[PDB]
Amino acid sequence: MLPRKNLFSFTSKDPSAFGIHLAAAAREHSVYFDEGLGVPVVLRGADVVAVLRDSETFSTRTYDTGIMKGALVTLGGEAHTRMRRLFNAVLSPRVISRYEEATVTPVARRVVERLVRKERAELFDDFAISMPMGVTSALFGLPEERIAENDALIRKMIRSVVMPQDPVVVAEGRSAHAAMEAQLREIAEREVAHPSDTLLGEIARAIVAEGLGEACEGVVLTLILGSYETTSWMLANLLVALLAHPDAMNQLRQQPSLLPQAIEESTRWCSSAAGIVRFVEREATIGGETLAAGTILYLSLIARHYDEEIYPRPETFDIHRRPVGMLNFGGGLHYCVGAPLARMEARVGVSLLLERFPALRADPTVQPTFSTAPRGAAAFGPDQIPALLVH
Template sequence: MTAAATRRSLPDLLAWMDRLRQRGTVHHDASQQCWQVLGHPEASTVLAEHTIFSSDVGDLAPRSAEIELFQRGNFLRIDPPEHRRLRGLASRAFTPRTVTGLAPHIADITSELLDAIGDRGRIDLIDELAYPLPVIVIAELLGLPAGDRPMFRRWADLMFDRAATNPDEPLTRLAEANIRAVTPVVRDMNAYLLEHIRRARSHPGDDLTARLVQAEIDGQRLVDEEIVGFVGLLLLAGHITTTATLGNTVLTLDQHPWAAAEVRADADLLPAVIEESLRLRTPFPRLLRRTSRAAELGGSDIPAGSMVAVWLAAANRDERVFPDPDRFDPHRSPNPHLAFGHGIHFCLGAPLARLEARIALGLLLTRYRDIQVATDAPVEQRDPWTMVSLNKLPLDVRRR
């Protein structure tokens, strides 16, 4: 297997986090000008204590008008009580019953995508399954044309596949570079989504966007500008996590053929395989918080107003919680990984991502008796400091 030479790899990130960990599971980093949190209990505390560790880090860098508009409805960056109001609306569309009811449709879409591949012996998992499946599902839920999915992918790639930057630079400098890079993308997204929202307001259908337009909270309806970031967040987060999980799990199984054999023999093991892959290849390796008041964490005193970087990828390899943490163990129990976060900002779409991954992987293993990562084509990875995911995963497959 080969990786694109210009890309930093997951082992690079793990080695870098190991060097950080040598300075303590919680410590101040003068170069990044923030507090680094690398331990599982400490990360869990930060994510759970939202009144102390705020999600509103909007002042990390100057923001453009486009970013301000997109952030209005982005409840990942909003604290209560506004967070409770917005997330409560979204939760209505992602109830366990609703998500479970999508299973037959997800299976149909997966089968159609695999049927389109036919009998070819070489496929690219990302292009032909891991990306189109979840984006079709979330686009349908939001009432967006699935035919626009090439544009959605371009947006996601530009947002989460940026050029490598120095991870030891101050967070403010990294944030400024990020704002410059994503502002044109956000401008395009805002315009597209505003048009979609206004169309849903004038000609409401039976999709989530139409329900958001009509929804009332305490007697008030959301304005279009609030719905933009809301729908944009669901669109992006509603597919990139599943895409990452599918690619990461297939890559992990290729690296551990004994586990692939086990899950083929016992399909009930598949959910545990997915969870262990999420632990070892955490899609979003880091979350940011800011202290609203002075806090004590892991034996360190953190002043008010401090930026806190919570490394989920490091917490998920904390040997205090996960014995032999670098070993892939689909029988690991319990497996309290933080790949989907924790607390009030726990990933709203986690049940849907898990369902999509389970169905798609199950059908993939059923259709092909042999699946191997190609040895003569590159596996293209995103920069793991931004997202642990794959852009290309060429597979050699043999049908049953």
């Protein structure tokens, strides 16, 4: 018997209360069975890093189902190394800067332009969502007239990865996947005679450089599923961090090149990634508790961020902290391959929003709530981001 607690149902109006709560609980026990999640959880940063380091004992087997079967994150050993090299090549710094100029800036400009005559915004709906809706179709040569349809298809895929059990929902994921696959096949087949300038174009060419033909559609769908919702929760909590710290927002105006390190601090102070899951391949012990072969284990990617031994005054948002060793993108073998795109999109989007709305600030009349199921999503974050845009 693990000790048992219910820490993930915690809600609050204070964005830092949950990380405080987890770090307090971790002082009491690192490993505990969370009755709200239904699984054992590892809290302490050192235990989480240790689990992530030992991929042979703690695998990604639980992910290897439905539309995720055989995908990058499910892979270990040599299989992962080979496929990971392909992904790394299509998200390298040259590619990131290329798509900064060709795709993300134009999209960010359009998104921000829409707000220009308005007095208020709810920046989750009006920015955090809008960014990846525009960026994903543009990156992958998907038609503008299908953006809503494809949003619904992707949300259905994502639902199926969250509800691996339910065979109707999985079945709906599977169908949505096949419609996306058909659009993306059609686009990928055109690349042979008419190579494009899109990212889906660089992928089709990288598949050949590694001698694969691994489907182009496959790579693209992995990137879509890994970015489409994550991006919105990262943007959402960046905006929270900025709008909640008018002293910091003042410093950023004075010195715009501080934005990247401000982003790094937003990801420590208010990470959107609550946790990830591992499969215990052979009995092991972590923080003194025994974990039977076959256990499904949840790793907190937040508690480390609030451990005062690692980050002093962790409750305080400091844009000069320059923190490292955050867990928001994971650690080890499966460390997020998309992190360069996420960082860039956050920087580009937010810089454009800030420069366009000198008066941008929190709206004092609405009290967002923070939870680990905001609007049902698998994230940590606010239910809305009410802002004032004028004077």
